[PDB]
Design a binder for this molecule. Sequence first.
Ligand SMILES: Nc1ncnc2c1ncn2[C@@H]1O[C@H](COP(=O)(O)OP(=O)(O)NP(=O)(O)O)[C@@H](O)[C@H]1O
Ligand SMILES: [Mg+2]
Ligand SMILES: [Mg+2]
Length: 334
Amino acid sequence: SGPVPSRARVYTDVNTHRPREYWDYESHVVEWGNQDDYQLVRKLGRGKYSEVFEAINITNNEKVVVKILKPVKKKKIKREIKILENLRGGPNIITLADIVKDPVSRTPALVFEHVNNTDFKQLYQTLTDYDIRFYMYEILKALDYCHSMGIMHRDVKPHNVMIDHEHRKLRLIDWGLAEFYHPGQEYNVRVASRYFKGPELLVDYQMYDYSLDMWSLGCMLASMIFRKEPFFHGHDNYDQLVRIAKVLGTEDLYDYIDKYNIELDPRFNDILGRHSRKRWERFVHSENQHLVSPEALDFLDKLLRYDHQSRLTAREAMEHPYFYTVVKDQARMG
Ligand SMILES: Nc1ncnc2c1ncn2[C@@H]1O[C@H](COP(=O)(O)OP(=O)(O)NP(=O)(O)O)[C@@H](O)[C@H]1O
Ligand SMILES: [Mg+2]
Ligand SMILES: [Mg+2]
């Protein structure tokens, strides 16, 4: 028994049909900006390989964000930078504004546009139905774009989407788990926040593709419209799968594993239990129903599918009726 291989059903050969230089972020030598253009104002936080600061560009007094990076692999730094430069100018993609190295210690930093994003509280109490379609659409543009440019984000979640609500401004950020898609390649399933990990990662199927981001996006949509964050709340990776099977049900779980000849850690077998597929309706209540509509559920239903080959692509999703009034507004004359 070997597992059945898989390929992206869209954008499969984007990197195949581009010069090596496009995807070979190791060959890339780096051209460095000037670290003395930037003053740190305040630490915004520490992640696994970095700390992020709010800063000011001193030559022009603009706020920027500076992500200072570990002695990490030089590979990780170069990957993020290459992906960042390849995608710059793309819609709702965060602009890498500059790259700087401390010339003595040689420790790298990335300098990003600043986004004055609304507190992930306060949005919660004010987003309307129209707001969600709109922002879901803007996310889809970024995700179609990067997918078309051969890149999986691999860390789609609400904290990696910056929204400046007073400006109706959205940016997809943290490109540090992001990677080039090459068909047939096996990837690390250690990616994405737990709550946004697709089933393919939870069953340790390594040949996955852009569809992963559409799962994570689905989880986001669910949490926005049901106002439950996160929507699937497992307490570890094992328990994450179970949270999924509890809603989508075990029958399609096992048909999925069956189809790819996947075979599970036997422990999973005892804790998975047996679960009916639930109706989306079950999660709709008085407090969330103004954000719910049948097109919203039909839309969500087509994101949250066990089978990665079955999920809506980014561009199909932008085609869905759910976005009718959004696209209608965005025939923009300018
Ligand atoms: N462009 C930006 N504008 C404003 N705030 C930002 C920006 N980028 C990051 N932040 C803040 O800093 C946090 C972390 O940014 P991120 O790029 O995800 O760091 P990371 O450590 O690489 N990711 P993770 O590994 O998930 O912790 C965000 O949740 C924001 O509060
Ligand atoms: Mg992040
Ligand atoms: Mg990260």
